[PDB]
Design a protein around this ligand. Structure first.
Ligand SMILES: CC(C)[C@H]1C(=O)N[C@H](CO)Cc2c[nH]c3cccc(c23)N1C
Ligand SMILES: CC(C)=CCSP(=O)(O)OP(=O)(O)O
Length: 374
């Protein structure tokens, strides 16, 4: 159970995790690092300082109980960031204008154990249920599926908080399809999609995938925790063993598909010379009452056999050619990592959704803070 391409779980001789020098002071907590990084990233994107301050207050309120753990000698290697930190920074560009800043976190127990962490992860949602801008009913209605009495050793649940320019924050949750083991994943997903009122579209997607190259591995079921028409159910499909043209064709089931956009993005960033260390992932979005996915967003891994500096160059160039603010992307990477030189592979994926008629191109980055050696 758990992601076969990256690692997470209890730290030990078999899963080592060592803090890098030159980042935060020796007694610093993950929350200290996250608050500072969040502020720096808002500045790098030219966002309002008052909005940064609000984002910090929100982070402390919702996650401070769990995130105030020492950076040095960690007991758990999280899934949320590629360096194993329990938080990850992200920026999202939806057409022109200031980017959204997002932080995604995991709540760990003291001391961190599968049972304790899973408890903390769902305790987080009880805290969130008290926040007026959050709608947690849809995820709490899934707790008996995703929170077994005995979690697996690599259990995870991730929580996102989005800081939006001139707007209220948005909250998101990412659930582990393997919560009850790999064998139970299909059943868990099926039941969850039933409960969320999107069976038709989900079963439709399942059928479609099986006739266009195979489903792959379901990486997460995620929910927008809002009671608006904009809220979606999201399923992440990890495309192990599929070529770029096939990933592109698989997206045709979703509204807004632009033939060739996904495969061009993959060629321009991941390349066609060496398989990437982990496969690309498509996020299919769903809405109750719609019989097909409403959108498909591609998560593009960095190229294998290519330096990180070149991976950043390719990503920035792709952004520009898409019309988006590549200067802001590079600045954000520097702020999030302290690695302006671009020598550390701290990106998770970059994400892309092409502009459909009447819409805007979208790009997003996801970057670990580089508190730990890779
Ligand atoms: C399950 C997806 C959301 C996920 C994924 O397939 N793999 C990541 C590790 O390679 C997990 C992950 C952690 N933080 C993320 C931020 C954006 C996308 C991610 C992730 N994946 C595409
Ligand atoms: C944080 C993880 C695990 C996947 C990220 S997808 P996302 O929530 O950034 O997607 P959107 O921001 O809704 O486009």
């Amino acid at each position: 159970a758990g992601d076969p391409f990256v690692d997470n779980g209890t730290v030990s001789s078999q899963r080592p995790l060592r803090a890098v020098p030159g980042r935060y002071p020796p007694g610093a907590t993950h929350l200290d690092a996250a608050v500072d990084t969040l502020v720096r990233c808002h500045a790098a994107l030219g966002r309002a300082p008052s909005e940064a301050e609000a984002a910090v207050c929100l982070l402390r309120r919702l996650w401070g109980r769990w995130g105030n753990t020492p950076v040095e000698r960690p007991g758990w290697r999280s899934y949320v960031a590629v360096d194993g930190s329990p938080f990850e920074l992200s920026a999202a560009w939806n057409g022109d204008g200031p980017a959204e800043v997002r932080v995604t976190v995991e709540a760990t127990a003291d001391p961190p154990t599968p049972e304790g962490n899973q408890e903390a992860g769902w305790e987080y949602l009880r805290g969130l249920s008290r926040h007026p801008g959050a709608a947690t009913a849809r995820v709490l209605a899934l707790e008996d599926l995703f929170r077994p009495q005995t979690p697996h050793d690599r259990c995870w649940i991730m929580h996102g908080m989005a800081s939006r320019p001139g707007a209220d924050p948005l909250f998101k949750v990412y659930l582990d399809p393997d919560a009850r083991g790999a064998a139970e994943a299909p059943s868990v997903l099926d039941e969850a999609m039933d409960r969320l009122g999107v069976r038709a579209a989900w079963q439709g997607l399942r059928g479609w995938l099986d006739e266009h190259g195979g489903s792959g591995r379901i990486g997460s079921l995620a929910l927008d925790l809002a009671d608006t028409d904009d809220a979606r159910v999201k399923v992440y499909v990890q495309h192990a063993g599929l070529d770029w043209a096939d990933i592109d064709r698989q997206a045709a089931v979703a509204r807004g598909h632009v033939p060739g956009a996904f495969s061009a993005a993959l060629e321009e960033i991941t390349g066609t010379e060496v398989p990437p260390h982990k496969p690309p992932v498509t996020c299919f979005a769903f809405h109750r009452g719609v019989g097909v996915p409403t959108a498909a967003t591609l998560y593009i891994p960095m190229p294998a056999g290519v330096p990180e500096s070149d991976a950043r160059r390719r990503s920035a160039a792709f952004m520009r050619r898409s019309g988006l603010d590549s200067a802001a992307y590079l600045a954000f990477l520097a702020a999030a990592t302290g690695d302006g030189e671009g020598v550390r592979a701290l990106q998770n994926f970059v994400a892309y959704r092409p502009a459909a008629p009447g819409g805007r191109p979208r790009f997003a980055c996801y970057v670990a803070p580089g508190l730990y050696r890779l």
